Amino acid sequence: MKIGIPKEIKNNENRVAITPAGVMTLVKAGHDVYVETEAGAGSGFSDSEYEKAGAVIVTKAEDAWAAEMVLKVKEPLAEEFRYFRPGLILFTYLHLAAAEALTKALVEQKVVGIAYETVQLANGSLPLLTPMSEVAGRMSVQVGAQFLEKPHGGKGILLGGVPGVRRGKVTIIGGGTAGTNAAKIAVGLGADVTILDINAERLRELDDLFGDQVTTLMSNSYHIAECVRESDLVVGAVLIPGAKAPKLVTEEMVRSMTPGSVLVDVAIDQGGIFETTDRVTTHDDPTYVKHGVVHYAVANMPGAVPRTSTFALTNVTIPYALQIANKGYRAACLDNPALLKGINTLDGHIVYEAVAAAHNMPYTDVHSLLQ
Amino acid sequence: MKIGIPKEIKNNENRVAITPAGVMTLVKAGHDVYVETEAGAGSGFSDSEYEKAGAVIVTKAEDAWAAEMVLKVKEPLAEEFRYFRPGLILFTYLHLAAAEALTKALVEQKVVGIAYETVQLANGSLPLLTPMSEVAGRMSVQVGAQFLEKPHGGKGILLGGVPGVRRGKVTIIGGGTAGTNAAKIAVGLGADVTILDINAERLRELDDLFGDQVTTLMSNSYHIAECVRESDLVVGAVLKAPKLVTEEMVRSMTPGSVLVDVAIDQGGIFETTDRVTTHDDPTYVKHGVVHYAVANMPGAVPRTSTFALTNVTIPYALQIANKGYRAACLDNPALLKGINTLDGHIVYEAVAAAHNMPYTDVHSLLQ
Amino acid sequence: MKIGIPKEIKNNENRVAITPAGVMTLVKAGHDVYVETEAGAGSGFSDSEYEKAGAVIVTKAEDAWAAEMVLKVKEPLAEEFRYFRPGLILFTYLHLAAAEALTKALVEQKVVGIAYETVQLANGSLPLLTPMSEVAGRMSVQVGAQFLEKPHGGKGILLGGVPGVRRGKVTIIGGGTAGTNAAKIAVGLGADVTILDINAERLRELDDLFGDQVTTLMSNSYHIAECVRESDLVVGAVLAPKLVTEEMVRSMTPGSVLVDVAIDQGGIFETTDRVTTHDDPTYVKHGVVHYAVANMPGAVPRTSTFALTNVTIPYALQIANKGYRAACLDNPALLKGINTLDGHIVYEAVAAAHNMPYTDVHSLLQ
Amino acid sequence: MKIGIPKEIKNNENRVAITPAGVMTLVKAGHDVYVETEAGAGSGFSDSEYEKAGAVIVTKAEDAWAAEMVLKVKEPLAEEFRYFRPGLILFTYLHLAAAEALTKALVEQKVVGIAYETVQLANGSLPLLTPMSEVAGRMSVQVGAQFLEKPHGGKGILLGGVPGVRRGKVTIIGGGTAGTNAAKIAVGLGADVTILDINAERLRELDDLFGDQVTTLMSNSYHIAECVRESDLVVGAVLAPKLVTEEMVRSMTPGSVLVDVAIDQGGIFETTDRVTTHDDPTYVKHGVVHYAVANMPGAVPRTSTFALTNVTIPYALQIANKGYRAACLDNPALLKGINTLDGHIVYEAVAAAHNMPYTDVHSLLQ
Numbered sequence A: 001m002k003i004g005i006p007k008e009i010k011n012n013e014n015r016v017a018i019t020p021a022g023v024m025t026l027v028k029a030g031h032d033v034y035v036e037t038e039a040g041a042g043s044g045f046s047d048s049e050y051e052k053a054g055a056v057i058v059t060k061a062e063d064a065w066a067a068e069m070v071l072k073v074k075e076p077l078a079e080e081f082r083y084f085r086p087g088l089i090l091f092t093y094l095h096l097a098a099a100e101a102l103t104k105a106l107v108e109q110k111v112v113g114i115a116y117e118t119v120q121l122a123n124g125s126l127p128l129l130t131p132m133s134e135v136a137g138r139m140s141v142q143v144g145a146q147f148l149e150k151p152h153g154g155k156g157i158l159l160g161g162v163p164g165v166r167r168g169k170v171t172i173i174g175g176g177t178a179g180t181n182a183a184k185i186a187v188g189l190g191a192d193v194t195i196l197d198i199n200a201e202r203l204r205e206l207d208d209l210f211g212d213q214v215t216t217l218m219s220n221s222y223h224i225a226e227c228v229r230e231s232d233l234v235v236g237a238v239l240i241p242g243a244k245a246p247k248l249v250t251e252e253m254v255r256s257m258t259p260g261s262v263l264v265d266v267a268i269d270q271g272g273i274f275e276t277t278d279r280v281t282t283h284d285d286p287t288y289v290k291h292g293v294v295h296y297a298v299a300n301m302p303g304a305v306p307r308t309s310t311f312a313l314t315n316v317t318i319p320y321a322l323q324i325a326n327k328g329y330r331a332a333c334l335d336n337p338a339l340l341k342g343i344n345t346l347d348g349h350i351v352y353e354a355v356a357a358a359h360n361m362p363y364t365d366v367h368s369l370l371q
Numbered sequence B: 001m002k003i004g005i006p007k008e009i010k011n012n013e014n015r016v017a018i019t020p021a022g023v024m025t026l027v028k029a030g031h032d033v034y035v036e037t038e039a040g041a042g043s044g045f046s047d048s049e050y051e052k053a054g055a056v057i058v059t060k061a062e063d064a065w066a067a068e069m070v071l072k073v074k075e076p077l078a079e080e081f082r083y084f085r086p087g088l089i090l091f092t093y094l095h096l097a098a099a100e101a102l103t104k105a106l107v108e109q110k111v112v113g114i115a116y117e118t119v120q121l122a123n124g125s126l127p128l129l130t131p132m133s134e135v136a137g138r139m140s141v142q143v144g145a146q147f148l149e150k151p152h153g154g155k156g157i158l159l160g161g162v163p164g165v166r167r168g169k170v171t172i173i174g175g176g177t178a179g180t181n182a183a184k185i186a187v188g189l190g191a192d193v194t195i196l197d198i199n200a201e202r203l204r205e206l207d208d209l210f211g212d213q214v215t216t217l218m219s220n221s222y223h224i225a226e227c228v229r230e231s232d233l234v235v236g237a238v239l240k241a242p243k244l245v246t247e248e249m250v251r252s253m254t255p256g257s258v259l260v261d262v263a264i265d266q267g268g269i270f271e272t273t274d275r276v277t278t279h280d281d282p283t284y285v286k287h288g289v290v291h292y293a294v295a296n297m298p299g300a301v302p303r304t305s306t307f308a309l310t311n312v313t314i315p316y317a318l319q320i321a322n323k324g325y326r327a328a329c330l331d332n333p334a335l336l337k338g339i340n341t342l343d344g345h346i347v348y349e350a351v352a353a354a355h356n357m358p359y360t361d362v363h364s365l366l367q
Numbered sequence C, D: 001m002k003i004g005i006p007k008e009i010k011n012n013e014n015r016v017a018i019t020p021a022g023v024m025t026l027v028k029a030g031h032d033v034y035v036e037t038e039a040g041a042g043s044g045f046s047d048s049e050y051e052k053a054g055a056v057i058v059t060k061a062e063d064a065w066a067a068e069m070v071l072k073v074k075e076p077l078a079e080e081f082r083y084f085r086p087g088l089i090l091f092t093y094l095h096l097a098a099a100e101a102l103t104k105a106l107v108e109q110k111v112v113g114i115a116y117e118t119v120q121l122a123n124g125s126l127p128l129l130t131p132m133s134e135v136a137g138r139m140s141v142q143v144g145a146q147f148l149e150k151p152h153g154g155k156g157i158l159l160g161g162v163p164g165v166r167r168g169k170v171t172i173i174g175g176g177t178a179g180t181n182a183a184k185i186a187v188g189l190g191a192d193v194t195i196l197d198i199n200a201e202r203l204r205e206l207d208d209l210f211g212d213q214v215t216t217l218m219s220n221s222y223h224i225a226e227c228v229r230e231s232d233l234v235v236g237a238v239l240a241p242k243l244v245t246e247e248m249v250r251s252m253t254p255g256s257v258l259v260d261v262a263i264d265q266g267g268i269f270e271t272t273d274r275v276t277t278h279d280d281p282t283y284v285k286h287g288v289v290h291y292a293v294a295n296m297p298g299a300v301p302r303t304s305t306f307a308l309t310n311v312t313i314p315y316a317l318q319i320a321n322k323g324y325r326a327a328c329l330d331n332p333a334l335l336k337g338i339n340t341l342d343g344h345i346v347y348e349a350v351a352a353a354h355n356m357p358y359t360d361v362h363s364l365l366q
């Protein structure tokens, strides 16, 4: 197959959908790989690294979009709908559910739209989201430590203190992928770390992973209120895999906090777990203050570490791209029930039930269209 | 003794030379303690907490300086020379060898000028500087990781990577207090960490402290070049520091790599650091490499730094209060090395030599 | 039941199919246990330790094979065919797909041939192969360290260096049983350790298990090329594709070392054209030391004997308590051990391999 | 100053007295550095890496020895005496108490003979011996592990066992540099580790350094007897009394292994009557494998070269910058390195050993 990778145009998106490594994998299995000039530059991948891995650097966005399969990171924007052909394979984060101009255009132009965030294994996990939760978790406590400094608005402490000086107190609410990764960094910076979860089995796994390095605590509104009161930093790391994030930290809890404490709501991309998070912050404008407490709620924390973020995402997308390339999108999706759950749009139909259901649009079961 | 702690007035100085706990130590020993209103605000110590520990809050700087002994963090500014007077005991970071005007004013007003940073134990250690090298070391890698992010001008990596993704490389040049404390934080963030030192015995001690968590490496120009070339972050942690990292080495680094120097207000080890920045505008780029050039990293964590400093300064201050400066220094040879100015003389050789001013033997004045 | 353990007679085979602790389990459950004199000597178990645990020591191999069930480690050699007889239960590593003459002798003599290596749990795992994978993994890096010494042909480094001196770099390809166990020894000897696996979930589990002691890296030909170029030691622990090409070995520094856990199974190195023995253990290609000695668990026969017999004797106990038929109908994993029964090959792959008739084992056991 | 590094010519000596990094230090301080072609090949340093660091490669040993200061690892052999000349500075391991012919040649030719091994800090430590003690310690347990494998004569265990299988037991006698470094490798290979020392303060420091990873035990003939009887591996790391008697070795299980870091210095084992080489490395007494190969750092020449040159070249730099006289009057540790000067033996022990006149070094340097 002819495989195309255009540069990300969405503002300050420094991630790309392939590395020299993933180029070399597709080239060696017999595919043609075209990379838009400068696509890797945001992540430190020069055009000459991509070239020596076997890829053709094309001058123009349309020459990458030309290819049978387009690999991207972000949603195609207004300006990119144009490039949609019939039987174009598009593989990227789509979140069609609240993107109606995108969904009509992939319906109308008969693009095969394959979504990173709906590829799903039999145990129900989303392998293609996990890496971004890992990056966001590791970032959460690094960001927390920065905001604890007096210059950024915090009370002016190191999480680890120093000899003869008390350590900062970190509460992580949610003990899954994001929270576990956040706890690793909070332990490593020398914080006194409490992790809360509702799942007693996850608490036992965290106790096996961390031992005496953390305290595991059963999550309930009382325990959350007690931890928040005494916290220098609270990391929000809850997912209810369908829903909006539950509001676990109340205004009354935030008001119980000491001035210059910090909240980082990893869970903001689902609405966030803090009642007091009234809006989404940006890397440019990361924080506001309410009740003397610094609030950080950046979506795309992993956007801050695009080189790490790109490796982690393409480590697990390119193996699914190789299947589509090697066997055509059809044989590969019949062969791989997890890839199949990726098809969001096919031959003008909206084959994913929840996206048709949220745009008031027709839903055609995907299996009937494939046989 | 009547003891005074004014607010630090230097720009964005948020540390303070006493905490409520130190107030309690001095009040219980029978001393009167006067704290200037808001002196602890920048470190999160309220007037009310100081008052509850036994302090009198005074409204005016002048009323804290009126005390027999004044404790501070920074050197008095020109606008504070007015408070100097014969027999005033001043105990603070003075750095008199760099400050001709302050030296002359302490001499002219016959101030007992005691420098935190020249208090020196029999083994050569400077115990009132150590806590600030510890904070600076812990901060160096936190700041370096922050500048590694794409938004702050770096190449955009986590030092610890994530599963399936390689870690960042950290080179720490210097395995003393600052460097050891930097290595702790670099290990904790998940970096591949190399520590260079010239002293074989310190590398053996570091091997005992860290084992497999780091690689210890003998310092020479070749090994420094080799580590710098492949580093994402380099931390300068050597005690006027030699220029160990050359322009050629910085130019060998990948773009969006980061350099941080603990020693930057003493020149630092990097040829390419032409100036000191502030928290407002903290970095510049040379050869695509981020140069974090903020001096006084401990000042970014004033509460931790205030606890770290006052943990070791207040016991000395307590000796001066109980016994008077004279018996305290005659009883404590480490505290005696703290005396820089006394009764209109410079008694610290290096300060006399720095300004070509007369030197006086400290023991001869104390008798 | 009467249970016999002959001495292993393959050249330099020093493992044994039971220890005194396994004798004790079988004798306390009421079985008669016969051990050939010297059977355990190669693994440091005296005739006397077997006797005190309740075994009868027999002077001749014949008398151990005359038992109703024979426990062994390796496959019977040609000169052991003479001991086969209708209704003999033989429980050992058989590898019949590779052994036509052995397969035909088990058919003709109507032996119940139970293969350690086809006993298989519901989850697909081979619990009687696992312990040799663990031992080979642990051994792989110990051998690598040895071959990095100059007098053995290596560049002459310690993996952990010394204070002021850089560490060796160890790349482990495959994060399963063997590769995880290799990583434990690489970490403990003080190497800089990278483990590659194609499976993102395994990389996460490895991160949970090792944290900062190793780097986990997604496997692909590019990551492999980059790791191999920098490596002092590469351990192949994949289960067998040629992941490490000749160009990759050529990129290496002279006196680097390659070890495959997978050697008699082909291995992952294009440049390992043949297998060697302990008296001429390595060859050099492009200045790189290729360690090619099969069966590294054979070099620690006492450890390997304990690790194998720990998990074999519970299955033997079932056969002895119930007889093979009810043991197999009660234990689906043990049922999959049966390769030959009443003159039939009951394991499809083995039948295929020799162009012989296959019979469904369930039909014969009824 | 002009500084020469000949190739070591003692049989199988693969270490070298400088690396490219040491060349670079000496050339940047303005010295001329001459390296004999192949000097570094045995430690993986090409003529080319030396040239890029600023050395001149010389075809003949003669041309390296013609330098004003000669850096070596080992003592000059008889056939190297011809290179000696009045005022030559030779900095190397000399061991003159053991080498009459070498001592007489250094006197007669008026060589400034500076011994790496008599450089001594104010605290009594020998900073240029320490790194070989570290390397030998790390090597001792790696060798022990190798000799516990059956094909090398051992009982056939892994030190760390495997899951469900007991670990090997390692006794380290002496908790100094070598014995501490041995303990690190014993712990990392997964051994049960006991370290004995007569010094209670060292046992506390060892407890601080290892905590629950080892047991610390006060040394006395009873504790030694009990540890040795149970040991799979005993590492002698004492600095040389016969702490391990023949009765103690006789109490051991067959295929156990003894390694002394101290072997060419006598060692602590009554039963090690002689030293061996890598081609016949062990002998067996009372079924116990005695490893008797001298100079284990010689087996990792690259690691050992880095570890030695890390601490030797700073002293060489001083000699080259100031000349030997002012370097020694400025550096009391380096002063103690001087063994021969202007036709005098200036190190009492060496004079004593050969019944020769002693001269006070301070009197000659004035």
Ligand SMILES: NC(=O)c1ccc[n+]([C@@H]2O[C@H](COP(=O)([O-])OP(=O)(O)OC[C@H]3O[C@@H](n4cnc5c(N)ncnc54)[C@H](O)[C@@H]3O)[C@@H](O)[C@H]2O)c1
Residues within 6 Å of the ligand: A129, A130, A132, A133, A136, A173, A174, A175, A176, A177, A178, A179, A196, A197, A198, A199, A202, A219, A220, A237, A238, A239, A240, A246, A248, A266, A267, A268, A269, A270, A298, A299, A300, A301, A302
């Ligand atoms: N752009 C970004 O910044 C970015 C990118 C990707 C993912 N993430 C986010 O990381 C956040 C967490 O996701 P994850 O992958 O760790 O989810 P996860 O499913 O792996 O773990 C979430 C945990 O929350 C626990 N939980 C549920 N209700 C709880 C309660 N009341 N109290 C405490 N714990 C509770 C669950 O038991 C589970 O262990 C999500 O919002 C996810 O979107 C953010």
Ligand SMILES: NC(=O)c1ccc[n+]([C@@H]2O[C@H](COP(=O)([O-])OP(=O)(O)OC[C@H]3O[C@@H](n4cnc5c(N)ncnc54)[C@H](O)[C@@H]3O)[C@@H](O)[C@H]2O)c1
Residues within 6 Å of the ligand: B129, B130, B132, B133, B134, B136, B173, B174, B175, B176, B177, B178, B179, B180, B196, B197, B198, B199, B202, B219, B220, B237, B238, B239, B241, B242, B244, B262, B263, B266, B295, B296, B297, B298
């Ligand atoms: N606010 C602050 O940042 C702050 C406060 C106090 C002191 N300091 C500064 O911290 C710096 C260093 O602090 P420390 O506590 O680590 O010092 P330290 O005195 O404990 O030791 C410095 C280490 O560097 C090593 N060293 C010397 N030369 C070297 C070389 N050429 N290559 C490699 N290693 C070499 C020494 O052997 C030593 O182990 C000093 O420059 C001092 O001025 C900073």
Ligand SMILES: NC(=O)c1ccc[n+]([C@@H]2O[C@H](COP(=O)([O-])OP(=O)(O)OC[C@H]3O[C@@H](n4cnc5c(N)ncnc54)[C@H](O)[C@@H]3O)[C@@H](O)[C@H]2O)c1
Residues within 6 Å of the ligand: C129, C130, C132, C133, C136, C173, C174, C175, C176, C177, C178, C179, C180, C196, C197, C198, C199, C202, C219, C220, C237, C238, C239, C240, C243, C261, C262, C263, C265, C294, C295, C296, C297
């Ligand atoms: N005599 C003996 O030495 C002996 C005895 C028994 C087993 N073994 C050997 O053990 C070896 C494997 O042992 P195991 O139990 O650890 O295997 P395993 O199946 O437990 O693990 C294999 C791992 O390799 C990974 N993998 C697959 N393809 C890969 C690629 N291209 N790159 C990187 N990783 C990849 C898998 O995801 C898996 O985690 C086999 O080769 C087998 O022959 C040897």
Ligand SMILES: NC(=O)c1ccc[n+]([C@@H]2O[C@H](COP(=O)([O-])OP(=O)(O)OC[C@H]3O[C@@H](n4cnc5c(N)ncnc54)[C@H](O)[C@@H]3O)[C@@H](O)[C@H]2O)c1
Residues within 6 Å of the ligand: D129, D130, D132, D133, D136, D173, D174, D175, D176, D177, D178, D179, D180, D196, D197, D198, D199, D202, D219, D220, D237, D238, D239, D240, D243, D261, D262, D263, D265, D294, D295, D296, D297
């Ligand atoms: N070529 C080489 O292999 C090489 C090179 C240099 C040094 N070395 C060797 O290293 C060996 C020792 O090295 P080190 O630097 O570790 O020594 P060290 O002096 O640092 O430590 C010796 C330790 O043994 C202890 N000790 C004394 N008597 C004891 C007894 N009866 N039982 C138990 N402990 C006792 C001491 O308290 C001390 O802690 C020497 O024997 C020396 O020959 C070898």
